[PDB]
Amino acid sequence: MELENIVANTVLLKAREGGGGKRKGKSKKWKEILKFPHISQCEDLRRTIDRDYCSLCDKQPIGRLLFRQFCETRPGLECYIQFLDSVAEYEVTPDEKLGEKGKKIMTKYLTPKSPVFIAQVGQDLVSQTEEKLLQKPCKELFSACAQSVHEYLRGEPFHEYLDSMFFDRFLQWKWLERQPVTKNTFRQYRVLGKGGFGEVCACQVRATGKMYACKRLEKKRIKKRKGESMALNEKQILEKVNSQFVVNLAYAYETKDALCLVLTIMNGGDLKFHIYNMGNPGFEEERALFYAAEILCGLEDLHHENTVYRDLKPENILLDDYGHIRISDLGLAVKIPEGDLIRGRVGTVGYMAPEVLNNQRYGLSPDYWGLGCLIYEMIEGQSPFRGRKEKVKREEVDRRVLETEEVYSHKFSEEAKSICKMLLTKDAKQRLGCQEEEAAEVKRHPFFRNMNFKRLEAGMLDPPFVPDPRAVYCKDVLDIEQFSTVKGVNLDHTDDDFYSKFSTGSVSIPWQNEMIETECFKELNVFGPNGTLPPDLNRNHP
Amino acid sequence: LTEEQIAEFKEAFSLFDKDGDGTITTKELGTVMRSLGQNPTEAELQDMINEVDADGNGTIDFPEFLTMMA
Ligand SMILES: NC(=O)c1cn([C@@H]2O[C@H](CO)[C@@H](O)[C@H]2O)c2ncnc(N)c12
Ligand SMILES: [Ca+2]
Ligand SMILES: [Ca+2]
């Protein structure tokens, strides 16, 4: 019934607006769900955890916050924390105020009579920093200083922290982090898309209120298609890639009927929706150029892991709350052995490069063909080789991709037509992006002439479009397609190994970041009167 | 169908039944739809309601909503 489309979007927007409203949308029992263990339950963790400063006090977000809390109880250490915060500010300071903020850092921290002098950074290294300040200072000026600061902190401060209540509290958060991830961890909202081995739906961690996308890979469907290794590979690439421009993995878990990937939710929707369901087809060259640059950066990040994406099409490019994009579905991504070519006729009609359609051996080149397709379609509002909803045989689409020149309208500036034709070169050996410089060749193309890629990769350029946080940029729920049921298929003990390899649970850094972002960390990380031990940290008894 | 799912469906229903009289009117539906940026006519609202309104009294109660959702 038509009302179902309204219910689905009203319910999703209610969840996205911080849940019911209070507790930020956390479950009413969220403090019971995330109740700390008593410290005596953490003994095995205490025994097995590797006491590595860099991991415990910096790269793990909760461990970093707890080490900083410990340091802030010591007057001689809080100065070093202050200095690291000022270095972080300096790293994100525009280049013409760089000199003066560097001067202020110098006089605040690094002179023997500075008000918050940090003595453990070498006077000689300070003088070197002074000298290179006075001659074109750059963003990475204070790295060496920061290094020396961490080198002081990893010794005696680290070892005192390990014996403190703040490390016990870290072990409690680590216990929570490793608890089982199940169906009951989450609540499922409307379906957002269909494909692969299942479907994608909005979902929510019940305890924290944080929204995510849940990609559900149906076990019976995987088994009928013998997709076990493909499912595992998609999970493993998602976990290994850590790029600003690729959707990231926060959880992987199992249900009775499915294996689930829990992924960054992208509330701006997919680029196919923005091309075709936001007024006239396509959008302006400014937008297409920005999205193209970010997609190119995401491709470069994958190719650095020698991973070819192979599935570029507007549906697979998503927009976040800020209007930045990420490449989403990695189900067709493959790691190419160093120096070699792979074979595999995969992808979507109208988006497969000629060397893929012909089942030739290929490397990274299909992704540059796909970038050409994406730019063309963003600007024109149409596939290069298929009319909008043209009733056309896939045989004919293949023929046009292999045989026909794509046609350019007045909507294309000369640079946009140039980059499209160079990326849509049918022979891969002559294709833009497929030369020595790899993505670098694309970055200097005159289409991107006013694109500073360094500032883009550092997130310093504003997207041209910011989505309405109260709008659903997706087809209505009744219009999402659906697989037919899988039939005569039988899950065995023989799949259990595979399931166990897939269902590794929470991903450590995204989980700790979720706890911080939702303020579950701030609200739960409490102590007793005057900072005394609370009962859960008090060894004497519960 | 679990009490869990019933309770969730009840919360969704309360997103429409804003006065809690146990029915969804065309006025209430129109308020929700206009919060989604749509501008339905009174007849469009009546058509959408009528599709769900089984006993024909011109509004949707929770049993009818539940039958639609399950
Ligand atoms: N795999 C993913 O990460 C996502 C896929 N979709 C939707 O599902 C469609 C694919 O079926 C896309 O075009 C989006 O509308 C998503 N929507 C929001 N966030 C995501 N993180 C995805
Ligand atoms: Ca009512
Ligand atoms: Ca009725």
Characterise this structure.
The complex is a heterodimer of chains A (542) and B (70). Chain A has 542 residues and is an alpha+beta fold. Chain A has a domain at 270-479: Transferase(Phosphotransferase) domain 1 (Transferase(Phosphotransferase), domain 1). Helices cover 43% and strands 10% of the residues of chain A. In chain A, a hairpin with a 2-residue loop joins strand 1 (186-195) and strand 2. The longest helix of chain A is centred in the middle third of the chain and has 20 residues, at 285-304. Chain B is mostly helical and 70 residues long. Chain B has one domain. Chain B contains four helices and two strands; from the N terminus they run αβααβα. Chain B has helices at 3-14, 26-35, 42-52, 62-69; strands at 23-24, 60-61. A two-stranded antiparallel sheet of chain B has the order 1-2. In chain B, helix 1 (3-14) packs across helix 4 (62-69) and helix 2 (26-35) crosses helix 3. The A-B interface holds A 1-4, 6-7, 9-11, 13-14, 187, 471-472 and B 8, 12, 15-16, 29, 32-33, 35-37, 48-49, 51-52, 60, 68-69. The structure holds sangivamycin and calcium ion (CA) (2 copies). The site of one calcium ion has 7 residues of chain B, from strand 1. Residues 17, 19, 21, 23-25, 28 of chain B line the site of one calcium ion. Chain A: A motif (Nuclear localization signal) lies at residues 388-395. Chain A: The active site is at residue 311. Chain A: GO terms for molecular function: ATP binding; beta-adrenergic receptor kinase activity; G protein-coupled receptor kinase activity; phospholipid binding; protein kinase activity; protein kinase C binding; protein serine/threonine kinase activity. Chain A: Residues 53-171 form the RGS domain.
